[PDB]
Amino acid sequence: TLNGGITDMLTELANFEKNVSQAIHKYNAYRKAASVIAKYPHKIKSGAEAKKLPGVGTKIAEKIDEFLATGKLRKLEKIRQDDTSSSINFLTRVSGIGPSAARKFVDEGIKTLEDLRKNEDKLNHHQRIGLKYFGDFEKRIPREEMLQMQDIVLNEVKKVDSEYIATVCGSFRRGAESSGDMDVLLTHPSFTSESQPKLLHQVVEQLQKVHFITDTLSKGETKFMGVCQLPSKNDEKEYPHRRIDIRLIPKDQYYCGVLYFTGSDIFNKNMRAHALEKGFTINEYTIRPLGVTGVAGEPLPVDSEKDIFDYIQWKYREPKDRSE
DNA sequence: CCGACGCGCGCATCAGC
DNA sequence: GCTGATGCGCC
DNA sequence: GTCGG
Ligand code: NA
Ligand code: NA
């Protein structure tokens, strides 16, 4: 809570910019500000003190002065009591309702969850499933539930084909106390960049046979997005439903994907800006050499995560320590 | 001053032909 | 019927 | 909104 009142404000402003204003660069500007402020180790006492930080400019500085002198933000107080704006903001908390659907709904008088319940006919399939599990989807997932979840995912995936490789990435892979969802990266030997896609459906189908996956938000041939729920012990309170994603990557790109999706995020930007001060370009799929021109060669065979630690030649930095 | 800002990705849905 | 654009939720 | 060419 050193600067919590300031970051809460910047994050509040950010959400309104994303959801009501539909100004995504302001959203990220506000969130960037909140990030550098949350990590600044002093109780900020002035907008001017703040403006020294990268991502804090004049306007956010002035907003801090008003916050620090009066407790509040006039613009925020006003927006907060504003029925149209705050309804739009709120409906975006329904998964499948982004800022356009929420603008559309608040135009036609749908402002609340109940209003959606009375107009299910006007929600696509994703939105219905977001509305149904609205509460569950806002709970975090404790690491201990992630382990049981990961037990089921790996058990069943090896059950369909012992040659599948599955990895749970996300902050969970780095050891997090809790997770917001489960991101599962899938691969098979029979799936290369130069390849046949039957493999995702087989795994989704097995996880629905054991009633682990309960609903389907979107499915294709390389990405699945849906809902899962741990089995209850018959007598106990039933676990909340959880968001789950499963990505079928090719094998020659898999460990690039594992690294990318594991992260953490800013770990990778260091990992990448400081990747090419060495001569091997990196993204999410491949590591490719460059030349004095700057055009890429052809990517060299990463078949374990740690050949991105040979090609750029860092030592071992495991899931654990990739905080940045 | 004025554009960049994830030099972003898979899938579901809509606008349009 | 199709393509391309736009909406969406994410590491 | 903040940065930088
Ligand atoms: Na600054
Ligand atoms: Na939403």
For residues A196 and A267, membership in a common domain is answered with: no
For residues A39 and A95, membership in a common domain is answered with: no
Among A205, A232, A260, residue at a domain's last position: A260
For residues A189 and A248, membership in a common domain is answered with: yes
- For chain A, after which residues does the C atom lie more than 2.5 Å from the next written residue's N, i.e. where is it broken? 195
For residues A134 and A160, membership in a common domain is answered with: no
Main-chain phi, psi angles of A16, to 5 degrees = -60, -40
Tell me how many degrees the CA angle A220-A221-A225 measures, rounded to the nearest 5.
45
For residues A314 and A277, membership in a common domain is answered with: yes
For residues A151 and A196, membership in a common domain is answered with: yes
Contact in structure between A257 and A285 (CB atoms under 8 Å): yes
Task: Say which experimental method was used.
Answer: X-ray
Domain residue limits at A133: 83-139
Identify the residue whose tokens are 């996956």.
A213
Which CATH number fits the domain that encloses residue A248?
3.30.460.10
For residues A48 and A132, membership in a common domain is answered with: no
Among A96, A118, A139, residue at a domain's last position: A139
Beta strands A182-187; A165-168: pairing state: antiparallel
Tell me how many degrees the CA angle A123-A181-A169 measures, rounded to the nearest 5.
135
For residues A207 and A99, membership in a common domain is answered with: no
For residues A209 and A275, membership in a common domain is answered with: no
Nearest nt to A93, CA vs C1'? C9
Q: How many domains does chain A have?
A: 4
Token couple for A214: 């309960």
**Any strand B atom closer than 7 Å to A223 CB:** yes
Token couple for A102: 């929420």
Tell me how many degrees the CA angle A251-A252-A253 measures, rounded to the nearest 5.
85
Query: Chain C: nucleotides under 7 Å from a protein CB?
Result: 6-11
Rounded CA separation A201/A157 (Å)? 11
Three-state secondary structure call for residue A191: coil
For residues A133 and A159, membership in a common domain is answered with: no
The DSSP result for A215-263, as a single string, is EEEEE-SSEEEEEE-PPP-SSSPPPPPEEEEEEE--HHHHHHHHHHHHS
For residues A145 and A135, membership in a common domain is answered with: no
Rounded CA separation A237/A285 (Å)? 42
Q: Measuring CA to CA, which residue among A39, A18, A20 is closest to residue A6?
A: A39
Output the CA torsion sign for A307, A271, A170, A250.
Answer: negative
Rounded CA separation A30/A11 (Å)? 7
Rounded CA separation A6/A260 (Å)? 31
Nearest nt to A26, CA vs C1'? D1
**Any strand B atom closer than 7 Å to A219 CB:** yes
Rounded CA separation A227/A219 (Å)? 12
Contacts of A231 (CB under 8 A, 6+ apart): A211, A212
The DSSP result for A271-298, as a single string, is HHHTTTTTTEEESSS-EEE--SS-----
Beta strands A287-289; A280-282: pairing state: antiparallel
Q: Measuring CA to CA, which residue among A16, A76, A63, A71 is closest to residue A37?
A: A63
For residues A135 and A154, membership in a common domain is answered with: no
